[PDB]
């Protein structure tokens, strides 16, 4: 049964609610982004209207085989009427195709659902600037002050410089990047660009990348692994055993691997600066954990909410424990007392 924090009051609408069967009273199912915890339940047998971005709709059609007649893609930054209710989709600064949804209720209430997002000051000059928001359904993944991490730009600077140094010292090194979902494509695209290489990957991953409207993508990726010195592999294979095995496969074209695991936050963030990050090494294999996040840090979250000044906050992440919920409620009250709303 569908939890309350997935229902939009005063509408027939749900958000990211595909794993509960037919939801009573739902006339339109919104999908914020193509991550498995959010799409869980969709397939070619789904026959209700799905509302989403163009990119998300490309992935629904090609990867999950949802029939075309039930996919309703909306343009971003554009007032649209869905089942008699004005909505707007906004870029969430998460993975490709990810949106926040603004709902203008018939009674005058305005609701923002962030989906998953990485708050940014650029959001303070979207269509959010133009009116008041009563209720915020908030991605609270990293809602605690211990969650610090660098900008995406500093992380990519570290990765490009690390990869370029290693391959210039040893032209026979291979770079490997881990993946298990869409998102974080800048990691492997930026490294391949500095090296003058395409990114090599499986046919299934190539298929997924081809749904993403990334400009000049045919120039950047390939299924011909052997022509490429940046390879993508499943995240599970980014360990010394998995990488040793991969190095066998290239037929002694390569004699060293440098591998990247973009994680979110890890507690090496509470002690180490990005500048100071070092790999784990075994023989001719090194593995770097790099803190590339597509969710808000605590400080970014706090700045967004203190700017928006919502009347009520409904968390959408970490809601399963009383300790989590109490911690998050305490920070919401601090923010409101400090800013004066
Ligand atoms: Ni996500």
Curated annotation (Swiss-Prot):
Changing residue 139 to N: Impaired nuclear focus formation, reduced interaction with PIAS and increased sensitivity to cisplatin. One of its GO terms (molecular function) is damaged DNA binding. GO terms for biological process: cell division; double-strand break repair via nonhomologous end joining; interstrand cross-link repair. It comes from the Eukaryota. Induction: During mitosis. The mRNA encoding this protein contains an internal ribosome entry site (IRES) in its 5'-UTR. This 5'-UTR generally suppresses translation while specifically promoting expression during mitosis, when cap-dependent translation may be impaired. It is found in: Nucleus. GO terms for cellular component: fibrillar center; nucleoplasm. Expressed in brain, heart, kidney, liver, pancreas, placenta and skeletal muscle. Keywords: Cell cycle, Cell division, DNA damage, DNA repair, Hydrolase, Isopeptide bond, Metal-binding, Mitosis, Nucleus, Phosphoprotein, Ubl conjugation, Zinc, Zinc-finger. Binds constitutively to TP53BP1. Binds CDC27, which is itself a component of the anaphase promoting complex (APC). Binds PIAS1. May be required for DNA interstrand cross-link repair. Also required for checkpoint mediated cell cycle arrest in early prophase in response to mitotic spindle poisons. Possesses beta-lactamase activity, catalyzing the hydrolysis of penicillin G and nitrocefin. Exhibits no activity towards other beta-lactam antibiotic classes including cephalosporins (cefotaxime) and carbapenems (imipenem). Belongs to the DNA repair metallo-beta-lactamase (DRMBL) family. This is DNA cross-link repair 1A protein. It comes from Homo sapiens. The gene is DCLRE1A. The chain holds residues 700 to 1040 of 1040 of the full protein.
